Amino acid sequence: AINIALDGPAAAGKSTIAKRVASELSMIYVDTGAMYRALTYKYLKLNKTEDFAKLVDQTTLDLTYKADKGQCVILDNEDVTDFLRNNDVTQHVSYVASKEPVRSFAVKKQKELAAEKGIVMDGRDIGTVVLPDADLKVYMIASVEERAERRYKDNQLRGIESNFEDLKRDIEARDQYDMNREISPLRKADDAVTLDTTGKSIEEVTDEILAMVSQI
Numbered sequence: 001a002i003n004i005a006l007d008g009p010a011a012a013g014k015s016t017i018a019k020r021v022a023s024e025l026s027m028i029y030v031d032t033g034a035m036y037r038a039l040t041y042k043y044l045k046l047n048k049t050e051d052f053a054k055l056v057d058q059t060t061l062d063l064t065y066k067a068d069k070g071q072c073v074i075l076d077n078e079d080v081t082d083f084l085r086n087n088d089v090t091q092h093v094s095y096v097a098s099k100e101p102v103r104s105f106a107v108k109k110q111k112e113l114a115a116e117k118g119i120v121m122d123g124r125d126i127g128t129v130v131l132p133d134a135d136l137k138v139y140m141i142a143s144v145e146e147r148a149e150r151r152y153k154d155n156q157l158r159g160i161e162s163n164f165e166d167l168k169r170d171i172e173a174r175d176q177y178d179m180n181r182e183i184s185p186l187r188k189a190d191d192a193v194t195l196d197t198t199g200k201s202i203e204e205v206t207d208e209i210l211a212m213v214s215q216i
């Protein structure tokens with residue numbers, strides 16, 4: 001029974017890696033970003049309301065998992081899993097995630113999900129705020145250019161055309177906003193281990209994290 005915190009900037013690979021690791025350790029992967037994006041989706045639907053307390057009050061949000069253990073986001077009884085990226089949500093999520101009522105709502109749900117351990121949770125404030133007692137806290141990093149290029153490649157693959165410069169600029173802007181916001185900004189926990197993903201296979205990084213897991 002262990003919990004693994006995986007924090008890092010945008011397009012750092014986190015979700016990918018978190019899936020593999022969870023798989024190999026027969027654990028469940030929780031993508032917290034999906035939660036903030038779902039709430040941002042609701043925000044857009046509500047004409048970008050500034051009343052986040054009310055938004056959260058009048059919203060139900062559950063994370064569920066399929067056969068392949070893939071995470072599904074159920075917002076107000078609708079599966080919005082496939083509408084949280086490569087669209088306007090990405091451009092507004094940092095702003096919405098900076099709001100107190102939003103973070104309080106999401107964090108409480110995230111802790112409930114990890115109460116019985118067995119969770120590999122990725123995000124920005126997992127090792128610092130959500131799972132301060134996680135058995136392993138990893139802080140994934142890579143250069144903006146590295147991350148931009150990897151996102152670009154992925155996109156071209158997935159059948160999504162994207163402009164490299166825009167991708168890099170948006171990634172930089174999101175990371176900057178997330179690192180400077182007043183509440184639970186993205187930052188390395190004192191007991192976290194830095195892990196550079198640059199020039200490393202999706203497998204290599206998974207192996208490294210597993211290596212650390214075996215030590216505890």
Ligand SMILES: Nc1ccn([C@@H]2O[C@H](COP(=O)(O)O)[C@@H](O)[C@H]2O)c(=O)n1
Pocket residue numbers: 010011032033034036037093094095097122123124125126174175178
């Ligand atoms: N644990 C988390 C996960 C995501 N977030 C917010 O959600 C956004 C989307 O994160 P992902 O790109 O990881 O999907 C981040 O840029 C950040 O603003 C957060 O503030 N804390």
